Amino acid sequence: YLQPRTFLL
Amino acid sequence: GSHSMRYFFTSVSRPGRGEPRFIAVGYVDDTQFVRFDSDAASQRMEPRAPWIEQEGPEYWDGETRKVKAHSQTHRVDLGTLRGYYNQSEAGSHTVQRMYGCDVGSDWRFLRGYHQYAYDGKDYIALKEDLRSWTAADMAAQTTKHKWEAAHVAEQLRAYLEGTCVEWLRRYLENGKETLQRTDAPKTHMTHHAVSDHEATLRCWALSFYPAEITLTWQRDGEDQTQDTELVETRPAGDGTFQKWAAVVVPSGQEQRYTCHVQHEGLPKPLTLRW
Amino acid sequence: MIQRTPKIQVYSRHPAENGKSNFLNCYVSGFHPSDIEVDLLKNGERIEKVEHSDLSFSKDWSFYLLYYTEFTPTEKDEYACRVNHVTLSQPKIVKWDRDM
Numbered sequence A: 001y002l003q004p005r006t007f008l009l
Numbered sequence B: 001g002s003h004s005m006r007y008f009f010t011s012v013s014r015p016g017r018g019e020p021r022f023i024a025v026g027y028v029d030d031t032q033f034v035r036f037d038s039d040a041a042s043q044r045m046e047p048r049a050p051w052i053e054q055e056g057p058e059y060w061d062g063e064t065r066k067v068k069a070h071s072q073t074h075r076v077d078l079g080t081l082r083g084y085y086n087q088s089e090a091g092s093h094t095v096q097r098m099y100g101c102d103v104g105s106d107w108r109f110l111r112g113y114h115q116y117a118y119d120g121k122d123y124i125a126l127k128e129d130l131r132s133w134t135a136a137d138m139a140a141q142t143t144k145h146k147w148e149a150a151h152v153a154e155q156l157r158a159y160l161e162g163t164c165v166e167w168l169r170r171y172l173e174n175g176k177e178t179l180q181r182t183d184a185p186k187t188h189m190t191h192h193a194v195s196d197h198e199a200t201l202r203c204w205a206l207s208f209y210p211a212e213i214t215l216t217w218q219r220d221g222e223d224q225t226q227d228t229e230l231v232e233t234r235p236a237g238d239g240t241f242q243k244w245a246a247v248v249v250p251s252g253q254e255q256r257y258t259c260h261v262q263h264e265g266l267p268k269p270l271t272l273r274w
Numbered sequence C: 001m002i003q004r005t006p007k008i009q010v011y012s013r014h015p016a017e018n019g020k021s022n023f024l025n026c027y028v029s030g031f032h033p034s035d036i037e038v039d040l041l042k043n044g045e046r047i048e049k050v051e052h053s054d055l056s057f058s059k060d061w062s063f064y065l066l067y068y069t070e071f072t073p074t075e076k077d078e079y080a081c082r083v084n085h086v087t088l089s090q091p092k093i094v095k096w097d098r099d100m
Helices: B057-084 B137-148 B150-174
Strands: B002-011 B022-029 B029-037 B092-102 B107-118 B119-124 B134-136 B188-193 B199-206 B214-217 B241-250 B255-262 B270-273 C008-013 C020-030 C037-042 C061-073 C077-086 C092-095
Touching: B002 B057, B002 B150, B022 B150, B029 B214, B057 B092, B057 B137, B092 B150, B107 B150, B119 B137, B119 B150, B134 B137, B137 B150, B150 B270, B150 C008, B188 B255, B199 B214, B199 B255, B214 B241, B241 B255, C008 C077, C008 C092, C020 C037, C020 C077, C037 C061
Parallel strands: none
Antiparallel strands: B002 B022, B002 B092, B022 B029, B092 B107, B107 B119, B119 B134, B188 B199, B199 B241, B214 B255, B255 B270, C008 C020, C020 C061, C037 C077, C077 C092
């Protein structure tokens, strides 16, 4: 189950 | 034993030949269960293990939505990193991301991971405390600064300690026949003359799961660490693993040597003789 | 930029027995970057129907892939894995040995 939020470098 | 869920993401810039490649794979322990490939027809998260195929359409729809959002983030990240390192748009670059969680034999949180590499080198890593960031250069310090300002570590921690562990438990239960199985090594020994004054003894471990194993040769009960050829544990391609260890035995000394096999599936370690 | 040379192992899924169906594997590991060319060879000629695993990587960020094909070993047929990568001056050919 993937992380529901992503964060830009 | 202990267990893990891990996701592995590879993003490769292809300056001439179109959009960046994005590959995602998910593992429980040593078993792949999902993939996404930006270049494939489906544009879906796809099953790669029988036990996950039974997850319904809400699961697959949600994993597809999230893997595409991941893909888009990585597409921007390749541009950001180029900027940070003042690199031209000429070269191909690689961004890799890995995240996931370890549980102990009790299936309770042991450790979390969330970390990146750029062109094969550590870029930024969430430290074991899951509160702070390891950045080795000014590029990564820039990422670190933005992520400390937006409280990213707190959001990652809640996933790594909560969601990740909950879903790993669900997978271990739903995939019990695959994931909670122990396949003890099938062992054999071969003998092969190399000259008239020496021979190779090769100790084999085949068809084992999980991959973790210790295969060692002793001479008169002394570990032969420095004098053993040991191949890297390798996939058979049926979900099991293989390994061998070999020693060069001078004439008449075969009986001095013992092969020792340790694996989760061996109630007792094996000692094998020629 | 970082460039790491592939380790190569060529081996069968099952212990080889002449005239018994099996899988020929070429496992490539420890390489960077991920661009790599792998062929399975039968008596020096490229096998057409070769599959591979989905690209993954180890703790140290090095890539690994399994290339595989159905085969039935015989006494005389020779198999090999041929690998090219930016780290290699020439294609590397690793011969299959049924006891390695």
